[PDB]
Design a protein around this ligand. Structure first.
Ligand SMILES: CCCCCCCCCCCCO[C@@H]1O[C@H](CO)[C@@H](O[C@H]2O[C@H](CO)[C@@H](O)[C@H](O)[C@H]2O)[C@H](O)[C@H]1O
Ligand SMILES: O=c1ccc2ccccc2[nH]1
Ligand SMILES: [Br-]
Ligand SMILES: [Ca+2]
Ligand SMILES: [Ca+2]
Ligand SMILES: [Ca+2]
Ligand SMILES: [Cl-]
Ligand SMILES: [Cl-]
Length: 337
């Protein structure tokens, strides 16, 4: 009964059938995670890195996190570290997790970044200064309905849906909440005048994103192996539309703005990503989901492996025939499709 729910939540028997791509390279300079990433229309890619998550491996617990930038229009894109400026943020404790971008009517680019300084959660709002390759911190957002934020999707400069992957803030309590299988994780709509729960009762809600026309919201429920599709309404509420099931732990969801396809980074075996073992490291798996509203969504494994190259894939996105894949605490891979 408990064996058994544990073995299925954590997919503890799963081994990964490989699925290769013609030409993949490790992104040089990423060795401490690349948990989330987001690619602008112009090919600039933001990557958050250095996440320290309780119970989870990290190779440099003393180094603070960073937001990296890659220009994917380059033949061999090199990463650089974005300089964060401003006096409203303590960088010494920057511990970045999910991110999302919003482009205003004036073409100002805002970056929203989930941050875990100590045990806590905030969402930091930055303005991207392209010529300078820097991030100007604008605002720290925190809220009782954002106790344990995993990812967000922005729908304005300080308006977003956020997944909380746990109900509790304290990591000792979170650990009990997860192992007891309470499924109290929930999703919050945040805006300046109006903050509310929009969906609830998830077993580790994680990735979240939105269709390019703004009518559907997708939420990954990691330990249930589901992605939930909701209709999103003009008053910002969500209503359940459908649920897809997978044989893998789904992490972050990227949405291709031309087709609306989902690109999902996934953990084939949960035991390996939650209990790190250098000799038995977590693998990587990327799904593409097409026609997600149709009667049978088309799901393809685009890339899959056991960890000998890339460990703990959480996120994948595409840009002009290339695929960039990030991980919780390891490296990043850039691939021809
Ligand atoms: C809402 O649902 C909430 O979470 C789960 C199921 O989703 C319920 O029940 C839970 O509690 C016990 C704790 O001893 C667990 O061993 C059990 O596996 C679990 O399902 C809770 O009583 C309810 O609080
Ligand atoms: O976004 C996250 C954050 C932590 C984490 C831990 C184990 C597996 C997947 C995870 N995803
Ligand atoms: Br450019
Ligand atoms: Ca995100
Ligand atoms: Ca639910
Ligand atoms: Ca995530
Ligand atoms: Cl708490
Ligand atoms: Cl569709």
């Amino acid at each position: 009964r408990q064996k058994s729910s544990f073995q299925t939540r954590f997919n503890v028997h799963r081994e990964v059938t490989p699925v290769e791509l013609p030409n993949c390279n490790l992104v040089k300079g990423i060795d401490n995670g690349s948990e989330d990433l987001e690619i602008l229309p112009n090919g600039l890619a933001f990557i958050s890195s250095g996440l320290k998550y309780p119970g989870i491996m990290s190779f440099d617990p003393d180094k603070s996190g960073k937001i990296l930038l890659m220009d994917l229009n380059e033949k061999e894109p090199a990463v650089s570290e974005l300089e964060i400026i401003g006096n409203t943020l303590d960088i010494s404790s920057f511990n970045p997790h999910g991110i999302s971008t919003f482009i205003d009517d004036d073409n100002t680019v805002y970056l929203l970044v989930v941050n875990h300084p100590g045990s806590s959660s905030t969402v930091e709002v930055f303005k991207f200064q392209e010529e300078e390759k820097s991030l100007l911190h604008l605002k720290t957002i925190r809220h009782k309905l954002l106790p344990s934020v995993n990812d967000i999707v922005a729908v304005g400069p300080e308006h977003f849906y956020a997944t909380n992957d746990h109900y509790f803030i304290d990591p000792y309590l979170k650990s009990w909440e997860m192992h007891l299988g309470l499924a109290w994780s929930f999703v919050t709509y945040y805006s300046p005048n109006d903050v509310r729960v929009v969906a609830e009762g998830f077993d580790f809600a994680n990735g979240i994103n939105i269709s390019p026309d703004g009518k559907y919201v997708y939420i990954a429920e990691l330990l249930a192996h589901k992605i939930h599709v909701y209709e999103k309404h003009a008053n910002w509420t969500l209503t359940p539309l459908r649920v897809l099931s997978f044989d893998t732990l789904v992490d972050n969801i990227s949405v291709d703005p031309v087709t609306g396809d989902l690109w999902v980074g996934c953990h084939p075996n949960g035991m390996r990503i939650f209990f790190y073992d250098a000799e038995n490291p977590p693998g990587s798996e990327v799904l593409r989901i097409q026609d997600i509203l149709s009667e049978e969504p088309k799901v393809t494994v685009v890339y899959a492996e056991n960890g000998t190259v890339l460990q703990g894939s959480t996120v994948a996105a595409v840009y002009k025939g290339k695929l960039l894949i990030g991980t919780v605490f390891h490296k990043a891979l850039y691939c021809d499709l």
